[PDB]
Amino acid sequence: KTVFHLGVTEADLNGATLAIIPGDPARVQKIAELMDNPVFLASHREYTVYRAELDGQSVVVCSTGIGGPSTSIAVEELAQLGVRTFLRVGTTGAIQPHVNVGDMIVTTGSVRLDGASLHFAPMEFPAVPDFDVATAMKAAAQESGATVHMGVTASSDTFYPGQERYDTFTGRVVRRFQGSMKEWQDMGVLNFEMESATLLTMCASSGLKAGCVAGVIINRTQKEIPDHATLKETEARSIKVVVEAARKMLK
Amino acid sequence: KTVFHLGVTEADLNGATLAIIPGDPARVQKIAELMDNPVFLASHREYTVYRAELDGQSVVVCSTGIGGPSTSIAVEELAQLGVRTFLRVGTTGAIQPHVNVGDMIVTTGSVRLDGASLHFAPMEFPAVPDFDVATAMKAAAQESGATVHMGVTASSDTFYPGQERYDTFTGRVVRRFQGSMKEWQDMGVLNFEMESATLLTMCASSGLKAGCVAGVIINRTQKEIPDHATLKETEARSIKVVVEAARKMLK
Amino acid sequence: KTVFHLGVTEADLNGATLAIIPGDPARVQKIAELMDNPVFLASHREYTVYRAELDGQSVVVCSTGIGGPSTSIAVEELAQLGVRTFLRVGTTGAIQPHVNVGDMIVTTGSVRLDGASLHFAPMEFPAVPDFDVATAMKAAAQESGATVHMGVTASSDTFYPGQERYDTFTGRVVRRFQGSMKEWQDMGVLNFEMESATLLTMCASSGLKAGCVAGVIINRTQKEIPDHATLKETEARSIKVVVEAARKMLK
Amino acid sequence: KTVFHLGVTEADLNGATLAIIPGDPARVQKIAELMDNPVFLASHREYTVYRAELDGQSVVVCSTGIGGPSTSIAVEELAQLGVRTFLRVGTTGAIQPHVNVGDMIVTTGSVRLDGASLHFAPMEFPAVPDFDVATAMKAAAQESGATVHMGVTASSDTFYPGQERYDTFTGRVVRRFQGSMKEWQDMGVLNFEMESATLLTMCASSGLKAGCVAGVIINRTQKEIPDHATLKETEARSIKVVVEAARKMLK
Amino acid sequence: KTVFHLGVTEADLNGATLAIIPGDPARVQKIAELMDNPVFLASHREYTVYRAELDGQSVVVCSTGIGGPSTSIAVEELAQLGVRTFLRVGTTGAIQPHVNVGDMIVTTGSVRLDGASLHFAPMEFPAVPDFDVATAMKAAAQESGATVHMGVTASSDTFYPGQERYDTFTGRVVRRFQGSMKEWQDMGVLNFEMESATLLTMCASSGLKAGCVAGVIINRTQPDHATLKETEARSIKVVVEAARKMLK
Amino acid sequence: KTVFHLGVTEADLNGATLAIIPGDPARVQKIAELMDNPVFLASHREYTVYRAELDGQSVVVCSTGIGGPSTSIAVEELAQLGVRTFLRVGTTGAIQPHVNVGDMIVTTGSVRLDGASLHFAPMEFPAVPDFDVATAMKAAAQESGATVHMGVTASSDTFYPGQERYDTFTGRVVRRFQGSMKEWQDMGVLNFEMESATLLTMCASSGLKAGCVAGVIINRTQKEIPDHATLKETEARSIKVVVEAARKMLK
Ligand SMILES: O=c1ccn([C@@H]2O[C@H](CO)[C@@H](O)[C@H]2O)c(=O)[nH]1
Ligand SMILES: O=c1ccn([C@@H]2O[C@H](CO)[C@@H](O)[C@H]2O)c(=O)[nH]1
Ligand SMILES: O=c1ccn([C@@H]2O[C@H](CO)[C@@H](O)[C@H]2O)c(=O)[nH]1
Ligand SMILES: O=c1ccn([C@@H]2O[C@H](CO)[C@@H](O)[C@H]2O)c(=O)[nH]1
Ligand SMILES: O=c1ccn([C@@H]2O[C@H](CO)[C@@H](O)[C@H]2O)c(=O)[nH]1
Ligand SMILES: O=c1ccn([C@@H]2O[C@H](CO)[C@@H](O)[C@H]2O)c(=O)[nH]1
Ligand SMILES: [Cl-]
Ligand SMILES: [Cl-]
Ligand SMILES: [Cl-]
Ligand SMILES: [Cl-]
Ligand SMILES: [Cl-]
Ligand SMILES: [Cl-]
Ligand SMILES: [Mg+2]
Ligand SMILES: [Mg+2]
Ligand SMILES: [Mg+2]
Ligand SMILES: [Mg+2]
Ligand SMILES: [Mg+2]
Ligand SMILES: [Mg+2]
Ligand SMILES: [Mg+2]
Ligand code: NA
Ligand code: NA
Ligand code: NA
C-alpha cells in the first residue's frame, strides 16, 4: 500500500500518471510550486515527493538521488503506483566546445557507463528515450528561448574517474576510462551526467515513457567559471522547461 | 579519386550531401525514379548507385547489401565523397502482435546484435538515429497514409539464429539467442532487421546523420501469410515515405 | 578547498581520518549522538555530514545515499579532506534461511553486481574489506551481544531485479539475474545490499581502509518487502556496533 | 521450396553437394565457366547462382556478398538444399611484409573480428576450416605453381576501422582496433578479409565442411587502397586454384 | 643460461628444436625410450625432462603437468632454449557416441575454455595447430594402425565442472557450464582435455609450431587397464612417428 | 572410494578434514615431517600425498602443481574424501618496494587473472579466503616473528606475460597485460602467484574453507639478488607458519 522507500500510497498521487524526477531533493518543491496546488507528500532518504496540478491533471514530483541505483527504486515504486511517464530534469557537464553553460541538452540516447541499466537489459539494448517525451522536451526547450542541443549523453556511475577527472585523491583513472573523455568528444557526445542510462534503459525495456533534459552547469572544455546568477537562472529555466514538457505529454 | 568499392567520384554525385540507402540493389532505380533526372552511376558487387534531383538538390541512392559489413563500406565511401545524411529504407519482421504487414516502423534505437557497430564504438554507445531524420521519417510516413510505429529495433547479423528461427538446416539456436525473441517482445522491441545497429552506431559516432524506416513484410506472431500484392504495395509505400523524408531533410 | 557535493572543508573535520558512512541521511545524527560533542556540518542532496569525538579523536559521520554512484562521491570527497578509513553501516536482506532479522553481517568480500566498482578496478579485482576493519567489526558485533555472521555479500545496483525480486511493476527479471538468488544461496553468499561492492573495490584499490557491517532487516526465504516493525531496533543495534568498531580502529 | 533469398530449388542444383562461394557476384560466372556445362540459375540481391559440372558431378557456385551476415544466409539456404561442402575464394590484404600481391593464402583459423560467428558459437569456439578442405586448397594452390601461405587470417566485419585503415572520412579508429594491425602482425597473422570467421565458425559448429583461399590484392605494410592493375590476374589465379580444390573434394 | 623452472641449459638439449610434451611426468621416459640414446636431464615439480635422438637429431621430451598454466611455463622455457616445434601427446574424454576408447584424436582447433590462452591472445584468436604438425600427426596415426579422428576439442581449465561432471562434492556446475557438454556435442566437438587451448594459442601467436594428439581413455556417452595401457602405448608410438615426419 | 587422480581412499586419510596444499610436490614431505607420525600415501603426476598427526588429529599434505587447473582437481578429490579446510603455502613475487624477500604475505583477496575460477563462479564473485583461515594465518605468521603483510594478491595463469615479464622468447606481452604490473602496484596489490584465485573462488563458492600464505622469493622492484641462504630460510619459515595456522584451525 505504502511503497517501501518512497513512503506514499497510490491515493496520495491523486491519479497522476506522469512524474517529474530531478536528482536533487531540494529541487522537488521548486518544481511543484511552478504548478497549481502543490502538496508535500513525503520525504525519506534521497526521496522527496510532492504532487501538484498541471492544466487540471495531477503530476508527481519525486527526486531520484544521484545515480542509477536510487533512480531505479524511485521509478519502480512510482510505476507500481500507476506512473507511466517519467521526465528527468538534471544538471550536466558539457564536453563539446560550444555547448555553453545555461544551454539545455535533450538526450537522444545514452552511453551506458552505469551498472543498473544491465539489471534491465543486456548492454546491446539502446538507452533511448521515448520519442514522444524527447519531442516534447525539445519543443519545450526551444519554445522557452533556450539554446537547445539534441544528442548523445555519456551516463556515468561515477562523478570522478568515469568522467575522466584527475583532480582527485589518487589522481589516477582506471584503464577503462583513460582517454575516454576525448573518445566521447570525438564521437560527438554532448555531455556527462549520472542517471540517464539507467532511467532510459529501464523504462524503454519496461513499457514506461522516459526522457532526460538537463541544464549545462559546467563545460569541461571551458575555463570561464559561471557565476551563481547564471546557475540559478539555468536551474530556473530547466525546471520551467520540464514542466512545459510535462504539459505537452498530458492528454 | 574514385572510391574503391562504389566506383564513383565526388564529381559524379553533383553535390549530393544526402543518400537514400536501401538494402536491395534492385530498389535503387525504383527510388531514383520517384525523383527528377535519375541517372545510373555504377554497379559493383552489391552496390548499385544512382543520382537524382529532389526539389533541385542532388541526392544519391546507393544499396548497402545485407548486413552491417557491406553497409559500413557504402556509408564510409559516400562520406568520403561528401555525403553527410543517410536514410535507410528497409524490410523487416515485426515481433509485436498488432504491428501488421504493410505498416512502417521508424527505429528510435537498435539492439546491437551485430558486429560492425563495435568497429565504431564500444557496446555501451547507443545505436540511435539522428533526431531530425527520425522526425522527418515519422512525418513522411504519417503524411503518406501509412500506419507508423516508433520504437526499438533488434538489429541482427543473421537472418536465422539471431532472429531465433528454428526452421533451419540444424534446427538449433546457440545459447545466446535461445529465448531471445520473447525477451525482446517483453521489452517492447518492435521488429528485426539487419543493418540499423551498424548504420546508426557508425553515423552517430562519426558526425553523420542517419535513420532507418522499414516496411513490415512478415509478422512473426501471425499465422496469416501476406499476399504478393501486399508485399509489392509495402515496398512501394516505403520508398514513397523515404523520398518524402529526404525532402523534409533538404528543407 | 571546499568539496563539490559535501559542502565541507578539511578544517571542518577537525583532523578526522575515520568516517562512519551509513546509506540513510537520517542515520547520521543518530550515529553522531552515540559519540561525544556531535556537531552538524552540512546537508546537501543525500549527504548529511556531522562530526563528533570518540575517545578524544575526531570522527566524521557522512551518509552515502543508496548505491555505488552516490557512495563513490562521498568517499572521494572525504578522502580529499584527509579521511582514510571508512566504516559502512547498512541494512541488508539475508538469503540464507537461518540468518535472522536483527542479526549483523560483516562482509568478507562482495559479489560485484554494481557498475561503479568498474570505474576503479577491472572486474577481476576483489571487492575485499581491509582486514583490520573486518576484524574490528566482528569483535565489536560480538562484544555488543549481537549475533554476527562473516561472509560474502552480493552487492547490487538495484533493489529489485538485481536482487531477483518479482513483486514488481513488470514482474520480470532480465536473463542475467534469472535464478541468481538461488545461485548465490548455493554458493554460500549471506546477503544482498547495495553499496559494498563499490565501496570495497574503490577503497582496496585506492589506499583507503574500508569495511561493511549491516543489520538484517528481512530474510528473503520469507518475503521481499521488509517489515517496518523491526527496523528501528535493528538499526539501533547496528549503529552501536559500528561505533564500537570505530573505537577499535582508533586504537 | 525455393529458398527465401537465393531463389533456387534443390532441383536447380542437379545433385550438387559442394558449393564454391566467392564474395563478388561477378566472379560466379567466371568460376562456372572454368567447369563443364555452366548454367545460370538466378540472381537476387548479392546472390548470383550458377551450376556447373566437374568430373561429371554437379557443383553450385553462389556469391555471398561482403560480410558474415550475407554469407550466413547463403550457407544456410544452400545447406537446406543439400550442400555440405563450402569453398570460399576471396581477395585479401596481406599484413606480413613478404606476402606479396598475387600470392594465395589458405586460412588455417580465423581471428573472429565479426559478429555473425557469435550467432552460431560463443567466442571460445575456434573459427577453423575442415581439415580435408584446407588440405585440398593447399594442394591445389601448390600444384598450380602459385606462391601459397598457410596460416591465421584476421576476419573483420569492416573494411576500414577493423582493418585499422586511417585514410577515411573521420581518420579515427575506435580504441579496440588501435594498434591492432601490428598486434596481428606480431602474432604471425597473415592477412585480413571479411567472411572467413563467420563461414568457418558456422560450418564447423553445424556439420558442414568449409575452407577459405584468397588472393592477395594489397600488402598493408605499403598502403591502404588496393591497386586496380593487379586485381584481374590475381582473381584469375585464385579461381583456377579453388576449382582444383573442389575437384579434390569430390572424390 | 638455466631457465627458472625446468632446470636445464641450452647445451643440455644438444641442439634440439623439437619437443614432445606429455602432461604426465611418468610418460616422459616412456616416450624417450622409443628413441635413441635417451638420457634423463632433470626433474623439478611437474617437469621431467629427457633428451633422445631421432634419425640422428636431438629431441627433447618434457612433461607439462595438468593445465595451461604449467604448460605455458614449459613451452616458454623450452623456447628460450631454442625449441620451436611442440608435439603434445595427451589423454582425453570423447563426447561423441562412436569415438571409442583407444582411438586417437588430432585437434584441428580448440574451444578455449581455459585462462592462459588469454595471456597470449584475445579470445577472438583461433586456438589452432600448425598445419604441418596436424598433417604429420594424422599421417603418423593412420600409419600406426590407429583409428584417428580430426576435429575440434574442448579444452578446459577444470576436469570437473568445465567438463560438466556432476559426480562431485557439490554436485553443482556453475551457470556458464550448465548444458555445455550437450552444446559441444551438438556442435560436433570430439573430446575434452586440459592443455590444447593454451598450447595452441600460445604457439600460434608466438612463432612456434604446435599440435595435440590424444588417446581416448573414456567416452562420456558409453574400460580395462589392458585397454588403458594399450591406449597410452599407441599414443606415444604415434607422437614419435609424427616427430619423425616433422624433422626431415 | 578411490578418486581418479590422487590415488588415495578416504580410509587412507584417517579422518582428516584439513589439508595443507603446497604447489611443489617436493615440499609435501618437508611439511609432513614438521608434524607427528608422517606417512607417505601416494605420488601420481604432480600430486604427492602424505598424512600426519597434529595435536592428535590427522592432517593431509597434498601438492597441487602449478596453476588453477591442477589445484582444482586436488581440492575436489580431497573434498570428496572429506576434507573441508585447505591451507595453501606458496612462493610469490612481491611487487611493492618494501615487501622484502623472506617476508610472508597472507592473501585477503585475489585478482582473478586465471581461468579456473570462472568454472566455479562468474567474475563478479570475490576470490576471498575464509575469514577464520586468514585470521589463523595472520596469527601464525606474526607469532613466528616474521614480517607479515595482509593484502590483495594478483593470481595469474602464467608466470611470464600475466606477470608482465618481458625477458622472454618473444619479448612481447599481449595488450590485456601491457602496463598491468604498474596498474596493480598503484592499486596496492602486494604480489603475484599462480593458484590463489582458483583456490579461493572454488572454496568460497563450494562450502570449503581456504586461505593462502606465501613466502616472498623475489621482489620485482629490487635489483639485489637474494642469497640461496635467504631463500632456504624463507621456505622453512613458510612451512612452520602454515603448520601453526593448521593447529589454529583444529577446534
Ligand atoms: O559535470 C557534471 C555535472 C553534473 N552532473 C550531474 O550532477 C549530479 C552530481 O553532481 C549527478 O546526478 C549528475 O547527473 C554530472 O554528472 N557531471
Ligand atoms: O523478418 C525479417 C524480414 C526482413 N529483414 C531484412 O531483410 C534482409 C534480409 O532478408 C535484411 O537486409 C534485413 O534488414 C529481416 O532481417 N527480417
Ligand atoms: O533486502 C534488502 C535490504 C536492504 N538493502 C539496503 O537498503 C538500501 C535500500 O533499501 C540500500 O542502501 C541497501 O544497501 C538492500 O539492498 N536489500
Ligand atoms: O585488404 C583487403 C582486401 C580484400 N578484402 C576482401 O574483399 C572484400 C572487400 O574488398 C571483402 O569481401 C573481403 O573479404 C578485405 O577485407 N581486405
Ligand atoms: O575425460 C578426460 C580424460 C582425460 N583428460 C586429460 O587428462 C588430464 C587430467 O586427467 C588432463 O591433462 C587432460 O588433458 C581430460 O581432461 N578429460
Ligand atoms: O614471481 C613469482 C614467484 C613465485 N610464483 C609461484 O611459484 C610457482 C611458479 O614459479 C607458482 O605456483 C606461483 O604461485 C609466482 O607466480 N611468481
Ligand atoms: Cl519511442
Ligand atoms: Cl540527434
Ligand atoms: Cl587488508
Ligand atoms: Cl576437421
Ligand atoms: Cl599453419
Ligand atoms: Cl568468511
Ligand atoms: Mg586510448
Ligand atoms: Mg532464458
Ligand atoms: Mg539458471
Ligand atoms: Mg567439422
Ligand atoms: Mg542451456
Ligand atoms: Mg595503460
Ligand atoms: Mg565460506
Ligand atoms: Na543516491
Ligand atoms: Na552483403
Ligand atoms: Na600443473
CSV table of N, CA and C in Angstrom, one decimal, chain B residues 168-234:
chain,number,residue,atom,x,y,z
B,168,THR,N,15.4,-24.4,-39.9
B,168,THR,CA,16.7,-24.3,-40.5
B,168,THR,C,17.4,-25.7,-40.6
B,169,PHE,N,18.5,-25.7,-41.3
B,169,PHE,CA,19.3,-26.9,-41.5
B,169,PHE,C,19.6,-27.6,-40.2
B,170,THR,N,20.1,-26.9,-39.2
B,170,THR,CA,20.4,-27.6,-38.0
B,170,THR,C,19.2,-27.6,-37.0
B,171,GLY,N,18.3,-26.7,-37.1
B,171,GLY,CA,17.2,-26.6,-36.2
B,171,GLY,C,17.6,-26.1,-34.8
B,172,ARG,N,18.8,-25.6,-34.6
B,172,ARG,CA,19.3,-25.2,-33.3
B,172,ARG,C,19.6,-23.7,-33.3
B,173,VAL,N,19.5,-23.1,-32.2
B,173,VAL,CA,19.9,-21.7,-32.0
B,173,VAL,C,20.9,-21.7,-30.8
B,174,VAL,N,22.1,-21.1,-31.0
B,174,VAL,CA,23.1,-21.0,-29.9
B,174,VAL,C,22.5,-20.4,-28.6
B,175,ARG,N,23.0,-20.8,-27.5
B,175,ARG,CA,22.6,-20.4,-26.2
B,175,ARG,C,22.2,-18.9,-26.1
B,176,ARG,N,23.2,-18.0,-26.6
B,176,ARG,CA,23.0,-16.6,-26.6
B,176,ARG,C,21.6,-16.2,-27.1
B,177,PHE,N,21.1,-16.8,-28.1
B,177,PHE,CA,19.9,-16.4,-28.8
B,177,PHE,C,18.7,-17.2,-28.4
B,178,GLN,N,18.8,-18.2,-27.6
B,178,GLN,CA,17.7,-19.0,-27.1
B,178,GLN,C,16.8,-18.2,-26.2
B,179,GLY,N,15.5,-18.2,-26.6
B,179,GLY,CA,14.5,-17.3,-25.8
B,179,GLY,C,14.6,-15.8,-26.2
B,180,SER,N,15.5,-15.4,-27.1
B,180,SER,CA,15.7,-14.0,-27.3
B,180,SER,C,14.5,-13.3,-28.0
B,181,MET,N,13.8,-14.0,-28.8
B,181,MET,CA,12.6,-13.3,-29.4
B,181,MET,C,11.6,-12.9,-28.3
B,182,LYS,N,11.3,-13.8,-27.4
B,182,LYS,CA,10.4,-13.5,-26.4
B,182,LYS,C,11.0,-12.4,-25.4
B,183,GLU,N,12.3,-12.5,-25.2
B,183,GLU,CA,12.9,-11.4,-24.4
B,183,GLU,C,12.7,-10.1,-25.0
B,184,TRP,N,13.0,-9.9,-26.3
B,184,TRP,CA,12.7,-8.6,-26.9
B,184,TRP,C,11.3,-8.2,-27.0
B,185,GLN,N,10.4,-9.2,-27.2
B,185,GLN,CA,8.9,-8.9,-27.2
B,185,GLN,C,8.5,-8.3,-25.9
B,186,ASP,N,9.0,-9.0,-24.8
B,186,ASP,CA,8.6,-8.5,-23.5
B,186,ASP,C,9.2,-7.1,-23.2
B,187,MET,N,10.3,-6.8,-23.8
B,187,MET,CA,10.9,-5.5,-23.7
B,187,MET,C,10.3,-4.4,-24.6
B,188,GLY,N,9.3,-4.8,-25.4
B,188,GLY,CA,8.7,-3.8,-26.2
B,188,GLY,C,9.3,-3.6,-27.6
B,189,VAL,N,10.3,-4.4,-27.9
B,189,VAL,CA,11.0,-4.2,-29.2
B,189,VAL,C,10.0,-4.5,-30.3
B,190,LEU,N,10.1,-3.8,-31.4
B,190,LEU,CA,9.0,-3.9,-32.4
B,190,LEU,C,9.3,-4.9,-33.5
B,191,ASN,N,10.6,-5.0,-33.9
B,191,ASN,CA,10.9,-5.7,-35.2
B,191,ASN,C,12.4,-6.1,-35.2
B,192,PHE,N,12.7,-7.0,-36.2
B,192,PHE,CA,14.0,-7.5,-36.5
B,192,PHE,C,14.4,-6.9,-37.9
B,193,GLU,N,15.6,-6.5,-38.1
B,193,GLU,CA,16.2,-6.3,-39.4
B,193,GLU,C,17.7,-6.4,-39.2
B,194,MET,N,18.5,-6.0,-40.2
B,194,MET,CA,19.9,-6.5,-40.3
B,194,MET,C,20.9,-5.4,-40.6
B,195,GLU,N,20.6,-4.1,-40.6
B,195,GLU,CA,21.6,-3.1,-40.9
B,195,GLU,C,21.6,-1.9,-39.9
B,196,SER,N,20.4,-1.7,-39.2
B,196,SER,CA,20.3,-0.4,-38.4
B,196,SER,C,21.4,-0.3,-37.3
B,197,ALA,N,21.7,-1.4,-36.6
B,197,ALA,CA,22.7,-1.2,-35.5
B,197,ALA,C,24.0,-0.7,-36.0
B,198,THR,N,24.5,-1.2,-37.1
B,198,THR,CA,25.7,-0.8,-37.7
B,198,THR,C,25.6,0.7,-38.2
B,199,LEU,N,24.5,0.9,-39.0
B,199,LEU,CA,24.4,2.2,-39.6
B,199,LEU,C,24.2,3.3,-38.5
B,200,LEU,N,23.4,3.1,-37.5
B,200,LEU,CA,23.1,4.1,-36.6
B,200,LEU,C,24.3,4.3,-35.7
B,201,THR,N,25.0,3.3,-35.2
B,201,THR,CA,26.2,3.4,-34.4
B,201,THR,C,27.3,4.1,-35.2
B,202,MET,N,27.6,3.7,-36.4
B,202,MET,CA,28.6,4.3,-37.2
B,202,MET,C,28.4,5.8,-37.4
B,203,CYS,N,27.1,6.2,-37.8
B,203,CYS,CA,26.9,7.5,-38.1
B,203,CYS,C,26.8,8.4,-36.8
B,204,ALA,N,26.2,7.9,-35.7
B,204,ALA,CA,26.1,8.8,-34.5
B,204,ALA,C,27.5,9.0,-33.9
B,205,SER,N,28.4,8.1,-34.2
B,205,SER,CA,29.8,8.3,-33.6
B,205,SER,C,30.8,8.9,-34.5
B,206,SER,N,30.3,9.3,-35.8
B,206,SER,CA,31.2,9.8,-36.8
B,206,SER,C,30.7,11.1,-37.4
B,207,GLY,N,29.8,11.8,-36.8
B,207,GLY,CA,29.4,13.1,-37.3
B,207,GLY,C,28.4,13.1,-38.5
B,208,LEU,N,27.7,11.9,-38.7
B,208,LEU,CA,26.9,11.8,-39.9
B,208,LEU,C,25.4,11.6,-39.3
B,209,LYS,N,24.4,12.0,-40.1
B,209,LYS,CA,23.0,11.9,-39.7
B,209,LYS,C,22.4,10.7,-40.3
B,210,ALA,N,21.8,9.9,-39.5
B,210,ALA,CA,21.2,8.6,-40.1
B,210,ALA,C,19.8,8.3,-39.4
B,211,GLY,N,19.0,7.5,-40.2
B,211,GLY,CA,17.9,7.0,-39.6
B,211,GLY,C,17.5,5.7,-40.4
B,212,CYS,N,16.5,5.0,-40.0
B,212,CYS,CA,16.0,3.8,-40.6
B,212,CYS,C,14.5,3.7,-40.6
B,213,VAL,N,13.8,3.6,-41.7
B,213,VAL,CA,12.4,3.3,-41.8
B,213,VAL,C,12.3,2.0,-42.6
B,214,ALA,N,11.4,1.1,-42.1
B,214,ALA,CA,11.3,-0.2,-42.8
B,214,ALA,C,9.8,-0.6,-42.9
B,215,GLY,N,9.5,-1.2,-44.1
B,215,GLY,CA,8.2,-1.8,-44.3
B,215,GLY,C,8.1,-3.2,-43.7
B,216,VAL,N,7.0,-3.5,-42.9
B,216,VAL,CA,6.8,-4.8,-42.3
B,216,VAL,C,6.4,-5.8,-43.4
B,217,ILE,N,7.2,-6.8,-43.6
B,217,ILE,CA,6.9,-7.8,-44.6
B,217,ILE,C,6.4,-9.1,-44.0
B,218,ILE,N,6.7,-9.3,-42.7
B,218,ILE,CA,6.2,-10.5,-42.0
B,218,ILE,C,6.0,-10.1,-40.6
B,219,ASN,N,5.0,-10.8,-39.9
B,219,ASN,CA,4.8,-10.6,-38.5
B,219,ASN,C,5.0,-12.0,-37.9
B,220,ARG,N,6.0,-12.2,-37.1
B,220,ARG,CA,6.4,-13.5,-36.5
B,220,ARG,C,5.4,-14.1,-35.6
B,221,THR,N,4.4,-13.3,-35.1
B,221,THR,CA,3.4,-13.8,-34.3
B,221,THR,C,2.1,-14.2,-35.0
B,222,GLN,N,2.0,-13.9,-36.3
B,222,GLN,CA,0.8,-14.1,-37.1
B,222,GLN,C,0.9,-15.3,-38.0
B,223,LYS,N,-0.2,-16.1,-38.1
B,223,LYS,CA,-0.2,-17.3,-38.9
B,223,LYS,C,-0.5,-16.9,-40.4
B,224,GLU,N,-1.3,-15.8,-40.6
B,224,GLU,CA,-1.7,-15.4,-41.9
B,224,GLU,C,-0.5,-15.0,-42.8
B,225,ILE,N,-0.5,-15.5,-44.0
B,225,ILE,CA,0.5,-15.3,-45.0
B,225,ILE,C,0.1,-14.1,-45.8
B,226,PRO,N,0.9,-13.0,-45.9
B,226,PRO,CA,0.5,-11.8,-46.7
B,226,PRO,C,0.6,-12.1,-48.2
B,227,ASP,N,-0.2,-11.4,-48.9
B,227,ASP,CA,-0.3,-11.6,-50.4
B,227,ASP,C,0.9,-11.0,-51.1
B,228,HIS,N,1.1,-11.4,-52.3
B,228,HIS,CA,2.1,-10.7,-53.2
B,228,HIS,C,1.8,-9.3,-53.4
B,229,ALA,N,0.5,-9.0,-53.7
B,229,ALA,CA,0.0,-7.6,-53.8
B,229,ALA,C,0.4,-6.8,-52.6
B,230,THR,N,0.2,-7.4,-51.4
B,230,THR,CA,0.5,-6.7,-50.2
B,230,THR,C,2.0,-6.4,-50.1
B,231,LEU,N,2.9,-7.3,-50.4
B,231,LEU,CA,4.3,-7.1,-50.3
B,231,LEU,C,4.8,-6.0,-51.3
B,232,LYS,N,4.3,-6.1,-52.5
B,232,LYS,CA,4.7,-5.1,-53.5
B,232,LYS,C,4.2,-3.7,-53.1
B,233,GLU,N,3.0,-3.6,-52.6
B,233,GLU,CA,2.5,-2.3,-52.1
B,233,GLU,C,3.2,-1.8,-50.9
B,234,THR,N,3.7,-2.7,-50.0
B,234,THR,CA,4.5,-2.3,-48.9
B,234,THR,C,5.8,-1.7,-49.3
